[PDB]
Amino acid sequence: SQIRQNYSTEVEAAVNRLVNLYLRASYTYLSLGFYFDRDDVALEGVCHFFRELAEEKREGAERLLKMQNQRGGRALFQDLQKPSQDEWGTTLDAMKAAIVLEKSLNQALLDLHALGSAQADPHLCDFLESHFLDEEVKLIKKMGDHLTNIQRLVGSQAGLGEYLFERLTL
Amino acid sequence: SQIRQNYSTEVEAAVNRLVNLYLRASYTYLSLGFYFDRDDVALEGVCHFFRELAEEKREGAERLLKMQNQRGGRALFQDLQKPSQDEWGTTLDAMKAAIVLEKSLNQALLDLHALGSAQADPHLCDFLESHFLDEEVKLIKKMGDHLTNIQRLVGSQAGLGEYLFERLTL
Amino acid sequence: SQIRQNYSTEVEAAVNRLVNLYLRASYTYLSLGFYFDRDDVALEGVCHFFRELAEEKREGAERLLKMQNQRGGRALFQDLQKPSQDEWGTTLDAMKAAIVLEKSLNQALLDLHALGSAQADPHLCDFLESHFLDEEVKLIKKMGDHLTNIQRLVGSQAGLGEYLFERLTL
Amino acid sequence: SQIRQNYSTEVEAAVNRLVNLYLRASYTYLSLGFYFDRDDVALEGVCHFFRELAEEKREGAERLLKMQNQRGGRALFQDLQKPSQDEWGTTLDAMKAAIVLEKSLNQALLDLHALGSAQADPHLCDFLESHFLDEEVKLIKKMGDHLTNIQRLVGSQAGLGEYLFERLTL
Ligand SMILES: [Fe+3]
Ligand SMILES: [Fe+3]
Ligand SMILES: [Fe+3]
Ligand SMILES: [Fe+3]
Numbered sequence: 238s239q240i241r242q243n244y245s246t247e248v249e250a251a252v253n254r255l256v257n258l259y260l261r262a263s264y265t266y267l268s269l270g271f272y273f274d275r276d277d278v279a280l281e282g283v284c285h286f287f288r289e290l291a292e293e294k295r296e297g298a299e300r301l302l303k304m305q306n307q308r309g310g311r312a313l314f315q316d317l318q319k320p321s322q323d324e325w326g327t328t329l330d331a332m333k334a335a336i337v338l339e340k341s342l343n344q345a346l347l348d349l350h351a352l353g354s355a356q357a358d359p360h361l362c363d364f365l366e367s368h369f370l371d372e373e374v375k376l377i378k379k380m381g382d383h384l385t386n387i388q389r390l391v392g393s394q395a396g397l398g399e400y401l402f403e404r405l406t407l
Numbered sequence: 408s409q410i411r412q413n414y415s416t417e418v419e420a421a422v423n424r425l426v427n428l429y430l431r432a433s434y435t436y437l438s439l440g441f442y443f444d445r446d447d448v449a450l451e452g453v454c455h456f457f458r459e460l461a462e463e464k465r466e467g468a469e470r471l472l473k474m475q476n477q478r479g480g481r482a483l484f485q486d487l488q489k490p491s492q493d494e495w496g497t498t499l500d501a502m503k504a505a506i507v508l509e510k511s512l513n514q515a516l517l518d519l520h521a522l523g524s525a526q527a528d529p530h531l532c533d534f535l536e537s538h539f540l541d542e543e544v545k546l547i548k549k550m551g552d553h554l555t556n557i558q559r560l561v562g563s564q565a566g567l568g569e570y571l572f573e574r575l576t577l
Numbered sequence: 578s579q580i581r582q583n584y585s586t587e588v589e590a591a592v593n594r595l596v597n598l599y600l601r602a603s604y605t606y607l608s609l610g611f612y613f614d615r616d617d618v619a620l621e622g623v624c625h626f627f628r629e630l631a632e633e634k635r636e637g638a639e640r641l642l643k644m645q646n647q648r649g650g651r652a653l654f655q656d657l658q659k660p661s662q663d664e665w666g667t668t669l670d671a672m673k674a675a676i677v678l679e680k681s682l683n684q685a686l687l688d689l690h691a692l693g694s695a696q697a698d699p700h701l702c703d704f705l706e707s708h709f710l711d712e713e714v715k716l717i718k719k720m721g722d723h724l725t726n727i728q729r730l731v732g733s734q735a736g737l738g739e740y741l742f743e744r745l746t747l
Numbered sequence: 748s749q750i751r752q753n754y755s756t757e758v759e760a761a762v763n764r765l766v767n768l769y770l771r772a773s774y775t776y777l778s779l780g781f782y783f784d785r786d787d788v789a790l791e792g793v794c795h796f797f798r799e800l801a802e803e804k805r806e807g808a809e810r811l812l813k814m815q816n817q818r819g820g821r822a823l824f825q826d827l828q829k830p831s832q833d834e835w836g837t838t839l840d841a842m843k844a845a846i847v848l849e850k851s852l853n854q855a856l857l858d859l860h861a862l863g864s865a866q867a868d869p870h871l872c873d874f875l876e877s878h879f880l881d882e883e884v885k886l887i888k889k890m891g892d893h894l895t896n897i898q899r900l901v902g903s904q905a906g907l908g909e910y911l912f913e914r915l916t917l
Pocket of ligand 4: 866
């Protein structure tokens with residue numbers, strides 16, 4: 238590649254794997270959101286929450302793919318593993334699942350940072366720090382807030398608390 | 408009739424019976440809504456829900472009657488059977504009743520479709536598919552959502568959940 | 578399911594497979610568009626073409642998923658097969674590939690129509706006819722137009738014609 | 748200097764040399780742009796391209812000079828070497844030259860990053876990452892796009908392709 242400069246094949250491969258990870262999370266959020274749209278689940282607010290996460294993680298991957306081209310790497314696409322569940326239980330269960338998912342993207346984001354730093358790629362480090370590293374911390378905090386408030390409500394009246402959280406928070 | 412063309416007497420009779428069915432549902436929703444307006448029931452939100460269903464099913468019948476004239480059939484009017492109940496119990500009971508009612512209009516709508524199709528009346532099929540078939544599926548889904556959320560709330564605090572649903576959903 | 582009515586398990590399974598097909602096409606268009614964004618390919622116009630197809634087929638699948646819930650079926654998600662190619666050659670090759678892809682969705686759409694009709698599901702037939710059947714014919718025609726104009730331009734000056742089409746048509 | 752803090756003489760000297768490098772590139776772009784304004788060259792679009800690069804690299808150096816003062820270093824000015832050519836040939840040749848030039852600023856930018864990092868100057872690293880590191884990658888990508896499109900057009904009709912690129916891209 239004529240434009241390629243200071244872009245290592247170790248990093249380019251990582252970005253490709255991270256594109257795959259973001260798309261699979263976006264796929265998971267798609268499943269999550271449409272499950273709460275079920276007539277036997279019927280939690281409007283929870284569905285819109287996970288559908289916007291699906292979009293956000295999709296724009297995240299499109300951002301990586303664009304950066305891949307700006308640096309002179311070749312995007313390579315793999316199969317998208319299906320979501321780990323077909324039914325996600327309650328809001329508390331869904332939220333729990335989401336937080337583990339975000340914590341594993343964040344893990345992947347940090348490893349890719351440590352990689353690009355050992356490779357002395359300051360532009361990659363700057364790209365992850367602005368568009369990704371901080372959004373991921375804000376989101377996990379916001380998700381943790383939700384977990385604490387759901388666990389409070391589910392406490393005695395499980396069915397009532399799920400309704401109140403969806404109406405009054407989401 | 409001079410304008411009549413490809414309009415069978417089997418179908419024309421069906422439309423007349425379906426006019427009668429829609430009017431009787433609109434009558435039922437009228438009863439339902441004014442029952443929740445009772446001082447000993449006093450659920451503003453539930454009353455407005457059923458009154459708008461009463462109007463919607465009334466416009467539905469006026470639509471059939473107009474189509475009847477556009478095709479060259481003769482509208483014939485029968486007695487409107489009174490609603491099956493004088494008192495409708497709780498929101499959960501009312502909703503249950505409504506869903507059975509909508510499911511029987513939808514049944515009538517599908518039979519009238521199957522009839523007009525066997526008669527090779529493509530215009531009737533198109534008329535039911537746009538103005539009726541899809542509204543009826545949306546509505547039953549929306550009603551099912553309500554049932555799931557009421558059943559969640561009525562769970563432990565029956566009286567409290569009825570209030571919250573009416574204030575926070577309707 | 579309480580809301581389910583006139584919805585067969587044969588059809589519900591088809592919709593799920595068609596959700597999968599639309600997502601995999603949307604995945605393909607994602608690959609196609611980002612390939613033309615390559616510095617060694619550099620055809621802005623062709624990239625934006627395929628990226629909007631990626632979105633459109635994604636909204637298409639979200640539409641099916643929403644309809645699945647409105648009818649009382651359960652959405653089930655499978656793995657997304659990766660795109661058939663990693664590099665797509667020229668505009669003429671990409672366009673050729675796209676048309677075969679659209680022609681196979683359209684095939685899937687027609688089979689699902691024939692299925693829902695034999696099952697006497699008039700609402701499914703109406704849903705495919707408005708939101709899908711006509712968009713798919715318009716698109717294939719528009720794609721065929723592009724093929725004829727590319728084949729004209731690639732005729733003598735392959736490299737020049739690709740530039741002119743991208744600047745003057747896309 | 749009273750305000751100086753965590754600012755090493757190795758780095759301050761680098762910034763001064765990089766000021767000189769940016770000014771000499773801005774000088775080169777000045778030559779490039781006014782050459783395409785020649786009546787025997789007459790490529791309006793190519794001239795405006797290189798003149799805006801001349802400004803941009805000039806603002807870049809003024810930015811370094813301002814940062815030098817904010818940190819407490821002393822700006823020292825050297826002679827500006829004249830451009831390497833007096834006549835730059837075709838658009839393809841000019842573009843080739845530009846890309847090598849940008850790739851050598853980017854090289855200088857990365858070395859100055861590696862230097863300030865080994866010196867543990869996090870503010871310098873942040874200054875290069877926001878105002879310079881990313882602009883330089885975007886630009887080289889954009890320049891590579893241009894090279895691919897020129898090489899496509901120059902293919903058979905060299906004189907015609909130069910005109911079309913200038914009219915339809917620049
Ligand atoms: Fe690297
Ligand atoms: Fe008929
Ligand atoms: Fe069916
Ligand atoms: Fe320093």
